[PDB]
Write an enzyme that holds these catalytic residues in place. Structure first.
Site, PDB file in Angstrom:
ATOM      1  N   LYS A  51       0.831  -1.209   0.000  1.00  0.00           N
ATOM      2  CA  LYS A  51       0.000   0.000   0.000  1.00  0.00           C
ATOM      3  C   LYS A  51       0.863   1.257   0.000  1.00  0.00           C
ATOM      4  CE  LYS A  51      -3.625   0.004   2.629  1.00  0.00           C
ATOM      5  NZ  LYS A  51      -4.581   0.021   1.546  1.00  0.00           N
ATOM      6  N   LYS A  66      -4.295   0.853 -10.550  1.00  0.00           N
ATOM      7  CA  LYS A  66      -4.628   2.036  -9.782  1.00  0.00           C
ATOM      8  C   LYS A  66      -3.602   2.215  -8.674  1.00  0.00           C
ATOM      9  CE  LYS A  66      -8.042   1.969  -6.740  1.00  0.00           C
ATOM     10  NZ  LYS A  66      -7.204   2.108  -5.501  1.00  0.00           N
ATOM     11  N   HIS A  88     -12.731   6.841  -5.147  1.00  0.00           N
ATOM     12  CA  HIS A  88     -12.345   5.899  -4.093  1.00  0.00           C
ATOM     13  C   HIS A  88     -13.041   6.394  -2.824  1.00  0.00           C
ATOM     14  CE1 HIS A  88      -9.944   3.384  -1.437  1.00  0.00           C
ATOM     15  NE2 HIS A  88      -9.811   2.586  -2.509  1.00  0.00           N
ATOM     16  N   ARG A  89     -13.696   5.501  -2.094  1.00  0.00           N
ATOM     17  CA  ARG A  89     -14.569   5.842  -0.968  1.00  0.00           C
ATOM     18  C   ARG A  89     -14.000   5.480   0.404  1.00  0.00           C
ATOM     19  NH1 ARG A  89     -19.260   1.029  -1.148  1.00  0.00           N
ATOM     20  NH2 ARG A  89     -17.701  -0.629  -0.923  1.00  0.00           N
TER      21      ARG A  89
END
Ligand SMILES: O=C(O)[C@@](O)(COP(=O)(O)O)[C@H](O)[C@H](O)COP(=O)(O)O
Ligand SMILES: O=C(O)[C@@](O)(COP(=O)(O)O)[C@H](O)[C@H](O)COP(=O)(O)O
Ligand SMILES: [Mg+2]
Ligand SMILES: [Mg+2]
Ligand SMILES: [Mg+2]
Lengths: 457, 455, 160
Positions: free
Chosen positions: A169, A192, A288-289
């Protein structure tokens, strides 16, 4: 203070309110707190705090004000249901272009009403937007069609876009980051940024953007196929978002139409989503949420559902939004969430309480992500019914034992199995990378395909 | 997959992590779902999803990555407590000026971890920001001193700013709106737009702004005192926010320093707050938090508390933020919420888990609002301990039986009652606007001062 | 932006929404702002769409801002009288990119809640592709009406 005579009109008919086209309707699940008013009194106070009133009478109220009151028009105390009609004149509009703003919709319909002392909880499950208000929203400017066109696919039902997220990440420096990109792109279409990747001290933004652009050009030369990247341009500062997007497009140059812009719309807010939508309307806007689960989880009885969030994102102009794995991955979700995908993709669809006509407003892609892998995909697709979408698998691609390319290939093959209506274990005998997903995720393989070992040897 | 060996180090000492100044610390109340991992395994997965990992091993991980992992350093399963240390290198910075962004702090520390299938819930109660990260935040550029200076008050302990909200929340046309402003300003200092007021078809923005500017001139000429207005400039579009703010300042002209800009920062987001902070740093930035209750309520076990929200708003640069009435008004709140005010106003303060040094970052005003009126104010101030703040009472001013001006004076006089140490019923014998607030809100008067009618 | 977006504003089906009844304000040049707006109002009692005649803009006898304001008033009056939505296509053509922006921004702000009833006309053959792109990229949510005055110099079959 009982304000039900003013703010409740249960003799109003929902079909007359829809037909009239002058009201936004919201459906909430609510409970009053103990020791205050009954259900209708509490629902009436809720409507007052969501439109024209307060908790006491004010002598500045006139009949013109009373005409724009939000009204409780339907209640079902047994199912904790409250429906409120908001006159569309209440919602704020831009001075510069006369268009709608989702910030005003949110402020009135799920704003201060979330802190009321006399309400235990209230959550919005659906909303109706009439034509006169719907047409004032931006809506998406770019869609999956624009990605399909770049990939050389049909612009109508162009099919499945094989994606990943760069994992770790955070922690990869620019060249290892770009190497992972290149490897995945040998077998996949789309990459992404993981949501927090940007301009960390160990992976400066401009160096990473330049290395990724070189990896895109090398993968495209090697494969002869077009590749896509979705860059995180999220910032508190509007001018930082612009600076990130402008640098990316200039750097990618002849591959600038292969770029999507990712915005963390729930944490940065609608203002950040609108910055990208209005500054870069010809670049796919990937919503993106991250953070949404704080209110959307069914464990929460406050705020709004994922269905409501997704429906607002289409109005805001997201080209795509994360709709979850509908129970098939690592995040909270349910099979019934397939209805969210239909609400954001179709011209007409049913929500839990309201039917919505989109009047040709462009669709928003369902972006499927969160603990997905080749093994979980066929069940996911069986529940949804189509694969005209983007699916990203970070752990599912970079956790494949034979590498990123193999992991990309394993996801392409998963969808090819579902499309041919094949049995995955039988299919696996002839598709290596997909059979090597069984060995990469053997806990998923024992659960989903018992005795896959005896047949895949 | 058990990731506790990598993402948990309970032998780390909090005092050494603070002293090192290389980590952001977050304290959460977290419960795992049944049928998954135990408390430490779940907290370790939580830290992985909040920093460098995912739910499975990835072969792209290197030792450099492992060095920036967020680490679970303290757990108390009996109290559902989990504390995580985030290396400050994880947080995104602006390419244009090298400064911090709260969007990155939020994405990592309370982002995807809020949708985890193996967690029942997880809410953040406190966070620690070390000097090296703290100094990269904007912080407030304008404070209450700048309002006190405009009012002609002392810039140190200038005192109570008597405020209101124009009520009806929506529905007043431009002239009726400006008439209510004028009336209140005959007795009060500050007026804010009710949070959704802007450019409604029945009250166009430019007409309303022009009528309010005329009402400010007339009230200032009549009273000989300076008056303040806080305008809502919230919008999805950055360019709409600029257009609203620029029009207001030009219109108010020689009264432009009497203007504050209100932003609905919770619903429009940090991006909208930063637009106002960076475009108009010389205008008081009023952070309105409509919607926050969806996560901050104690009824919620997710997201973050009002304390966390208020602390972030100071870093973002709010000149003031609504901190609630601390149980004395109509919204959810607790008397213990006074510690929120102290965290945003002092140079050093204690949160529920962490002590914070602000290194001279400007204070953020506690803005008190929500069902307040003259009767409820003494008890409010007794709990807080001071009145160097802005208090707005919409219903409390425009629900006063003798009008907005009388409503404004009842609020002024109730703070003079608290500042003087007087018995509110005895004080009301000599202060009519205050006494009439007992008649205006008799249900509150019967609760708070039992035999007020006889006296 | 496409005819879909005009049909939607008119309350028509967005697929095969049908015929948009239009006119051009005539005289081509010469009407002062109020007689110009009076002709708009009269036509809108029976029609949908009005475009500026291609050279109408900021002539000394019909200043742009006064004309835009009178037309916006006529649109509201016609909409109030008929209960139907009305459209206007404004000429924003200029040599200067910043003049095109200034014209378009003023129109949208003036029309306010009727801003989605506005189309922008560009004389794309004489001002060129650069002027067309200015309007397309600055105002993508406003219908871009390409007027081709001058094209006949090359497109006529008389020209080889
Ligand atoms: O950071 C992550 O966890 C992901 O990149 C997925 O990675 P993995 O494939 O390795 O799981 C996504 O952000 C989540 O899917 C977001 O959840 P949602 O789509 O529900 O919003
Ligand atoms: O709309 C309202 O209710 C208020 O204007 C108060 O009006 P009243 O004085 O009439 O009650 C404020 O927005 C709330 O105080 C917000 O709550 P909080 O400060 O907790 O964020
Ligand atoms: Mg991610
Ligand atoms: Mg308010
Ligand atoms: Mg002509």
């Amino acid at each position: 203070m009982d304000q039900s005579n003013r703010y409740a009109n249960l003799n109003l008919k929902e079909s007359e309110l829809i037909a009239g086209g002058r009201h936004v309707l919201c459906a909430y699940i609510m409970k009053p707190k103990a020791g205050f008013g009954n259900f209708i009194q509490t629902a009436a106070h809720f409507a007052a705090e969501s439109s024209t009133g307060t908790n006491v009478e004010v002598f500045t109220t006139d009949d013109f004000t009373r005409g724009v009151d939000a009204l409780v028009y339907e209640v079902d105390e047994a199912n904790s249901l409250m429906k409120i009609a908001y006159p569309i004149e209440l919602f704020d509009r831009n001075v510069i272009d006369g268009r709608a703003m989702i910030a005003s919709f949110l402020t009135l319909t799920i704003g201060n009403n979330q802190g009321m002392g006399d309400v235990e909880y209230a959550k919005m499950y659906d909303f109706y937007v009439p034509p006169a208000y719907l047409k004032l929203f931006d809506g998406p400017s770019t869609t999956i069609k624009d990605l399909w066109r770049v990939l050389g696919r049909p612009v109508i039902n162009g099919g499945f876009i094989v994606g990943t997220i760069i994992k770790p990440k955070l922690g990869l420096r620019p060249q290892p980051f770009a190497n992972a990109c290149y490897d995945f792109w040998l077998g996949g279409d789309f990459i992404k940024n993981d949501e927090p990747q940007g301009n960390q001290v160990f992976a400066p933004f401009k160096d990473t953007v330049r290395a990724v652009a070189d990896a895109m050009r090398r993968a495209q030369d090697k494969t002869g196929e077009a590749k896509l990247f979705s860059f995180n341009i999220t910032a508190d500062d509007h001018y930082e978002m612009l600076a990130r997007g402008e640098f990316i497009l200039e750097t990618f140059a002849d591959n600038a139409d292969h770029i999507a812009f990712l915005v963390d719309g729930y944490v940065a807010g609608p203002a950040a989503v609108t910055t990208a939508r209005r500054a870069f309307p010809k670049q796919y806007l990937h919503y993106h949420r991250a953070g949404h689960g704080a209110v959307t989880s069914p464990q929460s009885k406050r705020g709004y559902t994922a269905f409501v969030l997704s429906k607002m994102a289409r109005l805001q102009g997201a080209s795509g939004i994360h709709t979850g794995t509908m129970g098939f991955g690592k995040m909270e979700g349910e099979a019934a969430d397939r209805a969210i995908a239909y609400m954001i993709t179709e011209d007409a669809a049913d929500g839990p309480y309201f039917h919505q006509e989109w009047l040709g407003m462009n669709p928003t892609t369902p972006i499927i992500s969160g603990g997905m892998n080749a093994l979980r995909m066929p069940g996911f697709f069986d529940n949804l019914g189509h694969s005209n979408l983007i699916m990203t698998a970070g752990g599912g691609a970079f956790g494949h034992v034979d590498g990123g390319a193999a992991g990309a290939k394993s996801l392409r093959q998963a969808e090819q199995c579902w499309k041919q209506g094949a049995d995955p274990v039988e299919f696996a005998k002839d598709h290596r990378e997909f059979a090597r997903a069984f060995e990469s995720f053997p806990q998923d393989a024992d659960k989903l395909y018992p005795n896959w070992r005896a047949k895949l040897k």
